[PDB]
Design a protein around this ligand. Sequence first.
Ligand SMILES: Nc1ncnc2c1ncn2[C@@H]1O[C@H](COP(=O)(O)OP(=O)(O)OP(=O)(O)O)[C@@H](O)[C@H]1O
Ligand SMILES: Nc1ncnc2c1ncn2[C@@H]1O[C@H](COP(=O)(O)OP(=O)(O)OP(=O)(O)O)[C@@H](O)[C@H]1O
Ligand SMILES: Nc1ncnc2c1ncn2[C@@H]1O[C@H](COP(=O)(O)OP(=O)(O)O)[C@@H](O)[C@H]1O
Ligand SMILES: [Mg+2]
Ligand SMILES: [Mg+2]
Ligand SMILES: [Mg+2]
Lengths: 7, 7, 371, 380, 364, 174, 150
Amino acid sequence: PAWLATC
Amino acid sequence: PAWLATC
Amino acid sequence: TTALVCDNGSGLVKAGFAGDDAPRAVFPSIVGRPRHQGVMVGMGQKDSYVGDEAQSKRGILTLKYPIEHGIITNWDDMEKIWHHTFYNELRVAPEEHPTLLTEAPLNPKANREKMTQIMFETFNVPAMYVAIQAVLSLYASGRTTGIVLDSGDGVTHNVPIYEGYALPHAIMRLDLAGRDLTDYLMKILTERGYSFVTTAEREIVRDIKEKLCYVALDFENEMATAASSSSLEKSYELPDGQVITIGNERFRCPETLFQPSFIGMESAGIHETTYNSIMKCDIDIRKDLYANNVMSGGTTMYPGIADRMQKEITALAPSTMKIKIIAPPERKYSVWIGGSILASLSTFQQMWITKQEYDEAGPSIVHRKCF
Amino acid sequence: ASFNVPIIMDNGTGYSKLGYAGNDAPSYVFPTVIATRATEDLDFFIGNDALKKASAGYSLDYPIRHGQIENWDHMERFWQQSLFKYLRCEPEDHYFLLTEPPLNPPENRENTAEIMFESFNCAGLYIAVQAVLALAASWTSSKVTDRSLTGTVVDSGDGVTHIIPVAEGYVIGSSIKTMPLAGRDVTYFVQSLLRDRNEPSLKTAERIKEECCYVCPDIVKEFSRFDREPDRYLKYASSTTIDVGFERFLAPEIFFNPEIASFLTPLPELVDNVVQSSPIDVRKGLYKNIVLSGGSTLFKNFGNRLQRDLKRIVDERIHRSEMLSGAKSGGVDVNVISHKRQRNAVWFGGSLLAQTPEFGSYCHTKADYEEYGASIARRY
Amino acid sequence: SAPIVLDNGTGFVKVGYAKDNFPRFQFPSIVDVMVGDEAELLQVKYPMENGIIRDFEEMNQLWDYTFFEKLKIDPRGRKILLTEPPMNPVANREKMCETMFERYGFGGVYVAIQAVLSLYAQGLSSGVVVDSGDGVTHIVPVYESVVLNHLVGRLDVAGRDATRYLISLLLRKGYAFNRTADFETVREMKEKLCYVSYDLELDHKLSEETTVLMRNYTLPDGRVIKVGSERYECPECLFQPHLVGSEQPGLSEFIFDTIQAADVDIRKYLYRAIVLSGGSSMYAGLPSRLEKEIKQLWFERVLHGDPARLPNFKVKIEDAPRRRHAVFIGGAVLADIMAQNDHMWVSKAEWEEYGVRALDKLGP
Amino acid sequence: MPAYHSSFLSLTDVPTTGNIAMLPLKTKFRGPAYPADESQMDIIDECIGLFRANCFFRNFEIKGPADRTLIYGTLFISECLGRVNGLNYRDAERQLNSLALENFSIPGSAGFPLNALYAPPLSPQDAEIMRTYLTQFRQELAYRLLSHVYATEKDHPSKWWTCFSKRRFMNKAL
Amino acid sequence: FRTLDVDSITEPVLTEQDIFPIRNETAEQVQAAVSQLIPQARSAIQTGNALQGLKTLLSYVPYGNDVQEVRTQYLNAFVDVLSNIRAADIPAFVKECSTEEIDNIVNFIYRGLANPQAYNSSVLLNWHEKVVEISGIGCIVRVLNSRPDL
Ligand SMILES: Nc1ncnc2c1ncn2[C@@H]1O[C@H](COP(=O)(O)OP(=O)(O)OP(=O)(O)O)[C@@H](O)[C@H]1O
Ligand SMILES: Nc1ncnc2c1ncn2[C@@H]1O[C@H](COP(=O)(O)OP(=O)(O)OP(=O)(O)O)[C@@H](O)[C@H]1O
Ligand SMILES: Nc1ncnc2c1ncn2[C@@H]1O[C@H](COP(=O)(O)OP(=O)(O)O)[C@@H](O)[C@H]1O
Ligand SMILES: [Mg+2]
Ligand SMILES: [Mg+2]
Ligand SMILES: [Mg+2]
């Protein structure tokens, strides 16, 4: 979630 | 309350 | 002019000086904010809380972990934690002492350079270097080769090295860590009947996990025994006093690490990814890597993890190839020991990146002088 | 101007109590009653004066009832009287510390703030609750720093009672739990009981109550001291004597034996439900420091009865959980305390607080209301 | 000879047959024995305060009344399906199946999840469903007729909690309903005079500045009361659990995080299909408010202040007048579909052997 | 709560009769109460205390015939205390004997609530024992009330015993 | 969640209503006919026959797209030629008048009343009352439903 895209 | 612990 | 180090892991910050066998500050890395407004006058009522204070008065303060999966998310909370560490626990001004940092591999260069920039522009540190949380564990072990598997509360990675030469193409990383395990534990507890949804209850579940959770060789046999008999049902008390009992969940939890299909992830387990990584390297060094593989960081202190990993890697690899695990008792602080050793070394001094270099070249320098 | 001594006022359904700070005992305590009727019709009185009045044609009425203001006009008249006759103070050169129930609404809060800032041209004002002050009045020294903050306060006002599980100076807004008993209802019940057998109304009732009403660990296993020794049949006189009978022995049991008057749940079960609704990591402390307040609460053996009841309840629950599990847990320790403060702990705590210099900063300034208006304070 | 439908709920209970669009009977589960519609004075129990069951004997009495008074069948073999929350403790469903297989035959039940039931009811194969009952609510995603089983979400604040908060607000105002009675009247006035605020600040300013929004409601006894900000505030206490005393992000943020935890290639198909179920979801202004909250949360978390491409979101929430009985309709449809094959069910046999373990055949 | 337990829902013996109980007591008169020797746990004083306590209660739910017996005993004690106000020892005993031998047969007939005041009787095939036990219980309750309220000081009823009659058990005076 | 007043989506409709004949580029974007007709009304006032001047000035009317100086000068000349009229002949003038003319007259009367310090507003209220008593509420409801800018 905190990868600016995926996860 | 009726969860044998929390709530 | 003695150097220091501060491993800011997703579970707890381990900060301490160099040339020491054990750290000083072992304090949890959480920021708590009061749920209510507060009306008392002259008795605390601070607008924020950090460290053991949060864990103590957690029943009211909503908690937040600033860094997740090793990437930072709240820079304000991170710098607040750093200030609390430097000015309250260590009781030292970093203006007259360097600061060795730590970071996980395959992390955002933006995150690393922002960390360096804030550390240089806020604390006026003279020098600031970073490194991996695995070469430090290797140094602490005192070896010069082998593969290292870290399972910090945020991430879980494995890295091979041979005679000091790393192998980036063989490094492996995964987002599985203690937080997903605690979430799965809360889910299976709700399945049992016990509900845990808040942050203080999450910390209680994490404490339960640290206290009573093991692994076994035959997961199916253990499940059958737990479903047939009750020899595994273990009791645990809570601050309220109402004791509770837990069954097969204690060992069903780490099966997520050993079988991510439980939580939903599609990637393989630690054994399969370690075998793949080893296979990516050359056979002449695989022969030795199989003979000395070390474990480090939290999430691996479970009892019996060595036997399961040994059996799995032996079944996945040929039999004639001997295998030996290295899981000492001083693993939770292995990265700190490695950082202290490296800071105490002599040549490493020349590698310290100072203030003028950053001021004249900008943050981009960190991507060259370091790994 | 934050340098003089602040005035501490506390209105209530039963008794209004006002005085100054830095004092060991409160001042101007009286039952909060007003009496009134070229032409002005301004001749009125309050307190013991109004009580002694009504013989020459002066009406009477209670401004606040059920724990909520009802008539702002009479409330302002009462405040003006008490502030310009009883206390020869100046509302400008002194800061004010007012107390309101936890259920007071923002409309009434801002109405009071306005009628105090505008009509009385005050300078510094601070509105608070009774729970935190009554709790602060618990400890004795207040400086050793070994005091505790996590507590479960229960205030039994003369009109209404309630319970608040405070935790580290952070009041709770959900676990709050009220109850309309523990007030004048007990007096009305004792009066209806007396008017049935002995015709000789409510003054004598409250008098005999404050004089002799006590509790007993039981009632049916009790009543035996009465059946055996007639000495319990005291003789109280005002104007002749009256047979007490068993009012002194039955009245306070209304709490532990509810649904006797105008249904509810006993107090031990209520406080247990309150503590359970509260988070789990604060119950060990909430059960520890259970402080009381309100005159109607300062009974003879209230603390022992409540402690025994709550202890047996919690022990039964924990024993059920244990025998279900099979291990052995550490029996939580419940305690109760009331050290010469349950009577007027609110004013004592308010003064102890106001003694700090931070009070002058936490107050509201006149310019604040002038520029922002009457929308300064909304809720705790 | 068709199966029966029974979605035993928190406070309500609806029953019909294997195929019936509208439920044949519906009555509150409030409780010789007065179980049934006789509530129109004996003791009041309300056993199922949440998805859990406490007075299993009173639940058995209620089921007996429903099967013998509202219904005129007492079979042993007639399949009847059931409903329950997603992560309801196994003990509840175990006791339910045990009593329904011992006191009666009912060979084959196959209890299911209200989420997938309502999904069947709407006749869909993908999307997210947010059930909002009286004692609990849950959120379940689905993609291409497949359940995830790992992003399911539970949330124990709805209905009863909003009613208690409204009672506390009316107490703050002065009006008190401490009696065990009048709870149904407060529920009626809530479902009658309530609506979500599309703009909370606007509604607050309106209530503080204008005399409108203040309504007068009568009571069965005869007296009248006045209602104000509570009307538009109780949906906020639903939206803001911290106001009630629970530490949770809420509803919009909850579903947003639940979807973000999924795979990107599915996220779109979830923003395009969103269904609801439960009477608690019938609060006026709830769907559009939730849509706006989701849009704002996306704008904040992802774009960080770039409205250049916000219109290219394509969110389409779904709502209908039959969300009150979507679970019932879905149970009926599934019963009519599976009434042919008895293998998928759990017959009265193979119960004494490993009956409890047979219940594990549904949820791996 | 204020409604204490009957302390009789046990299984020491089988003295149950349809909806009443004829366990041992101190009823010196005749009736269906089987003989006994235990002179420690007297149900008479237990019921007297239960009634004196519940005189102020405002809630009482059904708890089986063992509780209906205590409810009927409390109602009879209240009726006796109300009807024996203006009398002396002689008049008290006279009124007690009248109420005992009065037109008070097995319960269920008109004079009480529809079904909550008492459960369905079992007079068919047991009316003899039912009436015997009812008469014995009525006589014992009347004698106990007379000995408690109408103490040896005849012509002067107990002040508290009479003041505790202003309330009706379950608020079912009529 | 947060509060940001999302409005970029589902834009409102403002110019769709109140059809605009402003696309002329004459007397509204260049201010030519207004400057040609205002001196005519001034000369009419000077000579005395102000009714014909008012009638000629009421022929063309500007709009409220963006310009306000020209319309303010128009309203000033209007108030002037109105104050220059006596207390009689207004009934005849309004009876021998159209409907849109009366609507524009009432609109300008209101726009003038919006600034009492710069005008008198007494003769304006008198004219409004006379128009109402002559025509009726139709003119008021028509001007209240006219363009929001004029
Ligand atoms: N020693 C005592 N024991 C028992 N009860 C007492 C005692 N002293 C006073 N009371 C009772 O307390 C009542 C007075 O309460 P008090 O006026 O102090 O409450 P209060 O602080 O005014 O409440 P509020 O602020 O809500 O009006 C009296 O009616 C009396 O019956
Ligand atoms: N018209 C309405 N508007 C708003 N709320 C309503 C309306 N009608 C009923 N409700 C609310 O819905 C609640 C009843 O929900 P219901 O029992 O239907 O859920 P359920 O299907 O039982 O959920 P579950 O199956 O999870 O128990 C009531 O508590 C009431 O407050
Ligand atoms: N005795 C233990 N048994 C099982 N798990 C443990 C134990 N001690 C710590 N852990 C787990 O290890 C995690 C701490 O990770 P840590 O090693 O601090 O990461 P980092 O190296 O990044 O600081 C915690 O989340 C906790 O769940
Ligand atoms: Mg780590
Ligand atoms: Mg008080
Ligand atoms: Mg439902």
